[PDB]
Design a protein around this ligand. Structure first.
Ligand SMILES: *[C@@H]1O[C@H](CO)[C@@H](O)[C@H](O)[C@H]1NC(C)=O
Lengths: 444, 106, 125, 444, 444, 125, 106, 125, 106
C-alpha cells in the first residue's frame, strides 16, 4: 500500500464514548496487638513479651498499606484545589449532560450514572465489614468494645468520605464541561462549550468549520452514546467486573480470616484461660504456644495477601492518576491511550472504590486515496498551498486539509507563488482562479 | 530506648517565642507526645503525634520534627506556661513507655 | 464531664500492701485502656503498666512485675492497684490516666497518648 | 460563572519580576580516623584496631555527603559548556540590565545584586570554619598541622570556586539576554532582545504587535521592578532567610561538635596519655573506652544530622536544577511554576551557596465578558475567522484574539467563507467590509 | 557577538547521514549445578549437599542476566506490532534506498549494509561458543550430552532469532520510508516520501518550498552520503569497534573460564574419582574440597564479570531503546541528539547483537548578519509581517523566514496594519507594494 | 514411540534387596535425567532420588540415603534400583520418570519437570 | 518447604469451570508443576512452569498465579478429568522435591 | 628540593637491634605521615607501620608489633626505626616514604598514596 | 584483602602499547595506586587513585578500571619503562596496606 503519486485521506468521521473503570482504594484494616495475642486472658504480660515482635511488624505493614491507600486516593481525587459553583443549565449547544451533571433536587447530590454504579456495586451482608459497621454505632468510643469481639480486627474509615469524593468529581466535571483547565493553576477563562470543542478539534488537526457545519450530528451521536452507555452498564454484568471482583476478594479474605480465628487448631479449646485452668503449667505453655503460632501464621498469610493486593491497587491507582493528569486536565497527544482513536474530552465519575472515565473519541472512517501533485503551474509560476495539499478527484483539482476531505476551489488566497514551474518536480498544469478578475470584467 | 530533652532551663520574657528540643536513641517515627506538668497539677496533653494538638489546646503551642528529633514551640510565654515539659513515647516496640527527663521554663 | 478521681494520700509501713483506687466518670468505663505512672521526687516518670477494663488483661513492666496487681470493677467503674512488699524506694506519686487522643485514621487502637489523668496519690514509707 | 453566549477575555496586562532563592551546596567536612580516635597518644595501635570500624563508616558517610554536594553544585551550575564574551552595551531597546550584567570596572566582576547577596550573607566569626580558614594559610601542607588542633576536623574546599560560579552565571546571563538558548547544543543565532521578547509573547499566546505598541510601558515596568527588588532585598531581612538559616545551622552544628570535643565526659581529664599515666592499665582501659564511646556517639549524632541536612539540600538542588532546565534555558509551558502568572524569561544570579532566579511574569488583568457568535452571515454565506473569535462591544462586532482584547473591524482577509448560514447554529447578521469596494467606487 | 539592529540568519543548508552503532544483547549462558560441582563422579550427593548453595546463587544470577538481556532485546526490537508488506519500488522521488531496503531476490532477505555488518562482525573459531554450536547438532536432546563435556557450560539460544529481528527491522524501514508513524497505535495514512520530507522540514522550521525547489540537490546529497557510508564502513575498521570489542571480550572470558576449568590447581589430578581412589578418605576430602573451592572462585569471578558486562549492555540497550522511541518513531525536537544538527529521519538496521541508526541531519551554514527593523511605515500606518522578519540586503528591504534566507518583496498580503508609526520604536521608512494598483492603472 | 516400562509387582520378605528395573524406549538413553518417586497408600509422593545415565552420578534424599543403590546399563538402557533392608513401612508404589519439559529459554538443564513416567511397581512386605 | 493444596474435594457438574489453589511455605517463583494422577494410571504432566502447558494437553486446562500461590483452572469437567491433582516443586534449593498433598475432584 | 635520605647498609648479629634513620629535606617535617615498607628478596612489599611526626603516634602491623619501635626528632627532622630480636627472616630492604598525593577534594587526610620515597637500607643477619 | 596482578611477564617491542591488569579479593573503590620499582632505584608513584597521574609523570602512562579490577596502560614501552609494577591499596579498612605481587616487563 505504497505509492509515489497518491495520498489517502479520511472522508467521514465518528464520535464515540468509551468507559474505563479503574479502582483507586480498598478497605483499610488493622489488628490490635494487645488483644490479638492476649485475648480473653486475665494476665498476658509474658505472652505479649514473647510474641510481640511479629505482631508489631504486621501492624507496621498494615499501617503502611493503609497510608499507601490513603495517599493513592488523595493523589487521584485531589489533583485540583480551586473550585466554583455548579452551572444550573444542563444543555450546552444541544449536548445533554443530564446523566453526567449531578442533580441538586436529589438529596444524594449524585448523577444517574453514579447512582447506578453505587447501586450495582455492593458488599456481602454476611461479612466482617458489615458486622463491624453495624456494631460501630457511628461512635469512636465503642471501637474497642466491638474490637474485643473480633480480637482487635477493626476497619479503618477512609480519609476522604463519599461526599468529598462526589464534590471533587462534580467540581472536575464543572471545570471540564464549562470554561477549561490550564496546564497548572486552576480554571481558565469562561468559554462556551461548542467553542471549546472546536478548539479541541483544532488541536487534533480538524478545522473548526467541520464542527460548526456538523454540530447537530456530533451532538446527536454524543447523546446516543450517553444513552446507550447507561443501558450497557445496567444490562451487562461484566462491565463492572474489576470493582466487584476486588470487593469480593477483600470480603472473602476477611471471611476466611475470621473463620480461621474461631478455629481451635490442635488444642482443647480456643479459650486461653481454659487451657491453663484445665492443664498444668508446663503443658499449658505449649498448648497455648501452638494456638499462638497458628494464629500468627494465619495473620501472616492474611497480611502478605493484603500486601500483594495493595501493590496491585497502588499500580492501578497510579495508572488512573496519570490517565487523569494526561486526559482529564487537558488534551492528550497519545493515540488510543484514552479510547480507540483520537482523545477529545474526559468526564470522570466516582464509583465505590473506583473512578470511571468517559473518554470521547474521534474516529476517522471511509479512507479514500486520490492523486496528488506537489505544485500547480498557471502562468509559468509555481504555486504552493498555504495550509493543505492538492487533491484530484479524477477531473478537477482542489486544496484540502490533510486529516479531512474538504474540497475547495483553487484561488489566489489559498496559494502562494515561489519560483518557476521548471525547477519543481511533479508540477501539474491547472488554472488558478483570481476573484478580482470577474469583478473587474463585470465593469466592462 | 532513651529520651533526652534540651535545654535544662530557660529564661524567656513574657510574650516571646521559645523552643524546646527532644531526641531519642533510635527512630521513633511519629509516636511522640509532649506533656505539661505543673508543680501542683497533674500532667496534661498538649501535642500528640508529630504536630497534632490536643483538644482545648490553644494555637500558640506547636510541634515539629521527625525521625529521632522533635521540637515544641510556644508563640508567647505566659503565666499558665510555667511548668515542666516531658516527652512520652507510646511506641509498642519496645514495650516500655520511656518518659522524658523534663525541662523547666521561666 | 469526664474526670478521673484518685484516693487521698496514704502512708504504709515497709513490706505492706498499698491499695490505690482510680475512678472514672463522664464516659463508659469499658472500651478505653487505663495506665499507671510513677513520679519519683527528683526523678522522671516511669510507666508501671496497664489494665484492660473490658476483659481484665494486665501487663506490667519487668521492674514492677509481681509487686503490682491490678483489678477492675466495672460495676462501680474502678481500677484498684495493689502494691506489695513496700520498699523504701517506692516513695513517689502514682497517677492513673486514660489512653486516648488516638488518630482515627492511619492508626490502630494500641498506639495512643494519654489525654485525661487523675489527681495523684502520694505514698510515704 | 457559566454562559453559552458570552466569552471572557483580558483587557490589561502587567509585567512583574519575582525572586526565587534556592540553596545548592553546603560546607563539606571530613574527620581523620588516625587522629580523632588516637589523639595526642604516643601509641594507639590497639585503640585504632578496636575502634576503627565505626570511624571508617562515618568517614565513608562524610565522603558520600561531600561527593553528593559537589555533584549537585556541578549539575546545577554547569548545564551549558559553550560560552562567548560579554556584551559591552548595557541597554537593549530601553531595558536596563545594569543590576544584572556584571561590571568589568569592578575587580570582583560581579553584579550589584550579587554583591548585595554576598555582603548580606556571611558566617559567624567565632566559628570553626573561620578558624580553619585563618589557620589554613592557603597551603595544603599545613592542613595536617591545623587538623591536629581540631583532632582531624577539616573543611573540604568546594570543587568549583566563586570565580568559576560567577563566570558560569555571567555566561548564562549573556546567553539569555542576547541571542538565545536552543533545546540542546549551545547558543542560538544572534537576535535583538526586543525581537526575542516578541517571540516569547508569541509563544505565550500574545501577538507581537502588542509588545511593539507597548514597548515603552513594559520597559518602564521592568526597570521599576528591577529597581524595587534591590530595595526589597536590602530592607527586608526575611527575603534571604533560607541561605542564612542553612549557614547558621551548619555553624551551630560545628560549634556544638567542637564544644563537645573539649568535654571531659566522665574521666579525670581529656588527655588520653594522662589517664594511663595516672592510673593502672585495667582501670585506664575503661577510663579511655568511655571517652572513646562518648566521642563516637557525638560524631554519630553529628554525621546523622549532616546526612539529614545533605538529603534536604540534595532535594533543594534537584528542584533548582529542574527549574533552571525548564525556565532558564527555554520557555516553560507550566503556569505559576516560575512566578505567579505566565513565565517569560529568567535571569539567574549566584549567591553564597545558592542561586537566585529573577522570573519575569506576565499577568492578565481586568477580565471582561462580551457576547460572542460562532459565525457571521453577510450575503447568505457563513464566514469564520482565520485566527480569533467574534466579540461584540455592545453595538458593533469585531474580531479579537483569545488572550487579549484587540478590536479589529471585520474584513474579507480576516475571515474565510465555508458553507451556508442555515447549517451553522448561532449565526449572527453583520456586514463584512471589502477593501476592494471603496477603491472600485472611487473610480466612478 | 551582540547587537540591537542586526539579525543573523543562515544562507545555505546541507544534508548529512550519520551512523550510530549500539549493542543490544549478548550471548546468554548457564551452568548446570548437578554437573559442575559433581563432574564425572559415581556418587556426589554429599558434595552437592555441601556446595549447592553458592552454585544455586550463581545459577540465579545467570538466569537474571539472561532474562535481562532478553527483555532488553525484546524492548528495543519489538516497539511496534502492526506490520504490512514491503514496497516493491526502490525509488521514491529520486531517493535511492537500495542499500537500506532488503532485496527479496537474495535468500537472506537482508540489505547490503546489513550483509556487510554481518560479514565484518564474526566470532573466533577457536572458541567455546563455536564448539558448542557445532556439538549441538540443532537438537535439544543432545544438549546434556555436550554439556557433560563442558561440565554444564551451555549457550542459551536467544529468544528472538536473526530472521525475526530482520523482519522487524524491515517493517520499521517500510513504516518510516513509506506512510509514517503516529504517536502510538500503528502506521499512519499513506503519503508520498517527498511530502513526508516536506512535512519534516516544516516541523524543523523550514518552509516546504525550499525542499520543492531543492529536491534534486538534497536527493543527490543523500545518495552520495549513502554511497560513502558503505565505503567508510568497509574500509575503516574502527567504525564497528563496539560490537567487535564486546564479542571479543565475551569470547576471551569464555576461553579463560574453560582454560581454568581444565586446570588441576593443587591436586594430584582433575579427576574427582581418581583422587578418592588413590588416596584415603580423610585426605581425599580436602584434596577435593580445594578443587571445588578453586572452581567455585573461578565461577564467581566469571559471574561477576558477566554481571558488570550485563549492566553495561543494559545501559546501552536502554539508550538505544530511548533513541529509537524519540528519533525513529517520530521527529525529535532535541538538537545534536541524533546526529550533529537537526534530526530529520532515522533508518534502523540490524547487526549481530546490535542496532545501527542512519540519522539524517540538516545543518545550516554560511550564517550572515543583516540589518533588521521591527516595523515598516508606508502611509503613516505601521506594518508588521504575518510570518517572518524584515531583512535588508544593504539597499532594499524584504521579508524572510527566521531560519533561512528567502528574500521576498514587501506586499500587502505578507504584512498587516496595526496602529500608527509613531508609537512603535525602530520604525523604518519603506514602500509597500500593492498588487491591485498596477492592475487598476493598466485599465487607464 | 517414547515409553518407560517397569517390572511387575514383586513381594519380598523384610530385610531383603528389591531390584526394580526401568527401561526407556523411543529416545536416546543418555542425556536425560531419570528420577524415582514413591507413592504410599493413603499418603503423598516422595522423591527418592535421581541418577545420571550419562556419567553415573547418583543423588538420594537423606531419608532414603544408603538404602537405595542406583545403577545404569547404557548397553540395554536399564536403570536398576536396589533396595536393601526392607522395612514394613516401605510398602508403596515406585515410579520411574524422565525429567523433561525444560524451558529452552531462560532456564538451565537442572530445572525440569517430569513429562513421561513409567507404569509403577508395587512392593509388599 | 511445605506444599498445601485446596480444597480437599469438589462436586462440579460436567461442563463447568473449576479451580484448585496451591501454596508453599516460602517463595517458589515459577518452579511449580501440576500433575494429574488417575487411580489406575501413572501421573501425567499437565502444566509446567507458571502457566505453560505440556505437549498434548488440551487448551481447557490453564494455570495462573505466582510468588507462593498458584491456581489451576479447568473450563469444563469431563470424565477424563476424574483424578487426583498434585503440586510438584523442582526448585534446586532446597534439594528435596516436595510434592503436593493431593486434591480429589468429582 | 624535597628528598628522603636513608642510612647505609648495615649488618647485625641475630637477636640484636637495628637503628635505621630516615631524614627529610625540602619541606616541613611535621604535617605529613611517614611510612615504612619492607621488600624481601624474591618476595613482595609489606607495610611495617607508620609514625606521625607532629604528635608521635605510632601504629604497627600485627606481625611487626613489638619488634619495631618508631621515634621522631623534629629538631633535626629524623625518624628512627629500631628493630628488636633480629631473626634470620628479617633480611630485607627497608624503605621510608612520605604519604602524599592526596585528593584535596572528595578525600580526607587518612587516605593517601606515597609520592616520595627514600634510598633503601639492606640488612643481613 | 589479597592483591593479584597479571600477567607475570611481557615481551613487548619498543613503541608499542601494553596493558597490565590488577585485582583484589573484595571491593577497593578508588583506593588503588600503581608503583614502578627499578632494580637499582626506589619505587616511584605513577598513577594514584582510579585514573589520576602523579606530578612529573608523562601522559603515556594511564589507568582505568573500578570496583575490584583495574588496569594500567602504556602507549609506548621505552628503556625507562623496564621495571616491576606493583599495586598498592591504601584503604583504611582493613588497616593493613597490602601490596601487589609484582609484574615484570621487557
Ligand atoms: C540603569 O540603572 C542604573 C542604576 O539605577 C542607572 O545608574 C542607569 O542610568 C540606568 N540606565 C539607564 C537609565 O539607561
Amino acid at each position: 500500500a505504497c505509492s509515489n503519486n497518491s495520498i489517502a485521506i479520511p472522508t467521514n468521521f465518528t464520535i464515540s464514548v468509551t468507559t474505563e473503570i479503574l479502582p483507586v482504594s480498598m478497605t483499610k484494616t488493622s489488628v490490635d496487638c494487645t488483644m490479638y495475642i492476649c485475648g480473653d486472658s486475665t494476665e498476658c504480660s509474658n505472652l505479649l513479651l514473647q510474641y510481640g515482635s511479629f505482631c508489631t511488624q504486621l501492624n507496621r505493614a498494615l499501617t503502611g498499606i493503609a497510608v499507601e491507600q490513603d495517599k493513592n486516593t488523595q493523589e487521584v481525587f485531589a489533583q485540583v484545589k480551586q473550585c466554583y459553583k455548579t452551572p444550573p443549565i444542563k444543555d450546552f449547544g444541544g449536548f445533554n449532560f443530564s446523566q453526567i451533571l449531578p442533580d441538586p433536587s436529589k438529596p444524594s447530590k449524585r448523577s444517574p450514572i453514579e447512582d447506578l454504579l453505587f447501586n450495582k456495586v455492593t458488599l456481602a451482608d454476611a461479612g466482617f465489614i458489615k458486622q463491624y459497621g453495624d456494631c460501630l454505632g457511628d461512635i469512636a468510643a465503642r471501637d474497642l468494645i466491638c474490637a474485643q469481639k473480633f480480637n482487635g480486627l477493626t476497619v479503618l474509615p477512609p480519609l476522604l468520605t463519599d461526599e468529598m469524593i462526589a464534590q471533587y468529581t462534580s467540581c472536575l466535571l464543572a471545570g471540564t464541561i464549562c470554561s477549561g483547565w490550564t496546564f497548572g493553576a486552576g480554571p481558565a477563562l469562561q468559554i462556551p462549550f461548542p467553542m471549546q470543542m472546536a478548539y479541541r478539534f483544532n488541536g487534533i488537526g480538524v478545522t473548526q468549520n467541520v464542527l460548526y457545519e456538523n454540530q447537530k450530528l456530533i451532538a446527536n451521536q454524543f447523546n446516543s452514546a450517553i444513552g446507550k452507555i447507561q443501558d450497557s452498564l445496567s444490562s451487562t454484568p461484566s462491565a463492572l467486573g474489576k470493582l466487584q471482583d476486588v470487593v469480593n476478594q477483600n470480603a472473602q479474605a476477611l471471611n476466611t480470616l475470621v473463620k480461621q480465628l474461631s478455629s481451635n487448631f490442635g488444642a482443647i479449646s480456643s479459650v486461653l484461660n481454659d487451657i491453663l485452668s484445665r492443664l498444668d503449667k508446663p503443658e499449658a505453655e505449649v498448648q497455648i504456644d501452638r494456638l499462638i503460632t497458628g494464629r500468627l501464621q494465619s495473620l501472616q498469610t492474611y497480611v502478605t495477601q493484603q500486601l500483594i493486593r495493595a501493590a496491585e491497587i497502588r499500580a492501578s491507582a497510579n495508572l488512573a492518576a496519570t490517565k487523569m493528569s494526561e486526559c482529564v486536565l487537558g488534551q492528550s497527544k497519545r493515540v488510543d491511550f484514552c479510547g480507540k482513536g483520537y482523545h477529545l474530552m474526559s468526564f470522570p465519575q466516582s464509583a465505590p472504590h473506583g473512578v470511571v472515565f468517559l473518554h470521547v473519541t474521534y474516529v476517522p472512517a471511509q479512507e479514500k486515496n486520490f492523486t496528488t501533485a506537489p505544485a500547480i503551474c498557471h502562468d509559468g509560476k509555481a504555486h504552493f498551498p498555504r495550509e493543505g495539499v492538492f487533491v484530484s478527484n479524477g477531473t478537477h483539482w482542489f486544496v484540502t486539509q490533510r486529516n479531512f476531505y474538504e474540497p475547495q476551489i483553487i484561488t489566489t488566497d489559498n496559494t502562494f507563488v515561489s519560483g518557476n514551474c521548471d525547477v519543481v518536480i511533479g508540477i501539474v498544469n491547472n488554472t488558478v482562479y483570481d476573484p478580482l478578475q470577474p469583478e473587474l470584467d463585470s465593469f466592462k | 530506648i532513651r529520651m533526652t530533652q534540651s535545654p535544662s532551663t530557660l529564661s524567656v520574657s513574657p510574650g516571646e517565642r521559645a523552643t524546646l528540643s527532644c531526641r531519642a536513641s533510635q527512630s521513633v517515627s511519629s509516636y511522640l507526645a509532649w506533656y505539661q506538668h505543673k508543680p501542683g497539677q497533674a500532667p496534661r496533653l498538649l501535642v500528640y503525634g508529630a504536630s497534632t494538638r490536643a483538644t482545648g489546646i490553644p494555637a500558640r503551642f506547636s510541634g515539629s520534627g521527625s525521625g529521632t528529633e522533635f521540637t515544641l514551640t510556644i508563640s508567647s510565654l505566659q503565666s499558665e506556661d510555667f511548668a515542666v515539659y516531658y516527652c512520652q513515647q507510646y511506641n509498642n516496640w519496645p514495650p516500655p513507655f520511656t518518659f522524658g527527663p523534663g525541662t523547666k521554663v521561666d | 464531664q469526664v474526670q478521673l478521681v484518685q484516693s487521698g494520700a496514704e502512708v504504709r509501713k515497709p513490706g505492706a500492701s498499698v491499695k490505690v483506687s482510680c475512678k472514672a466518670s463522664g464516659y463508659t468505663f469499658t472500651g478505653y485502656y487505663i495506665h499507671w505512672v510513677r513520679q519519683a521526687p527528683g526523678q522522671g516518670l516511669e510507666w508501671m503498666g496497664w489494665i484492660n477494663p473490658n476483659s481484665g488483661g494486665t501487663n506490667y513492666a519487668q521492674k514492677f512485675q509481681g509487686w503490682v496487681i491490678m483489678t477492675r470493677d466495672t460495676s462501680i467503674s474502678t481500677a484498684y492497684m495493689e502494691l506489695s512488699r513496700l520498699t523504701s524506694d517506692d516513695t513517689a506519686v502514682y497517677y492513673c490516666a486514660r489512653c486516648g487522643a488516638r488518630s482515627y485514621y492511619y492508626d490502630s487502637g494500641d498506639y495512643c497518648a494519654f489525654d485525661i489523668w487523675g489527681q495523684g496519690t502520694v505514698v510515704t514509707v
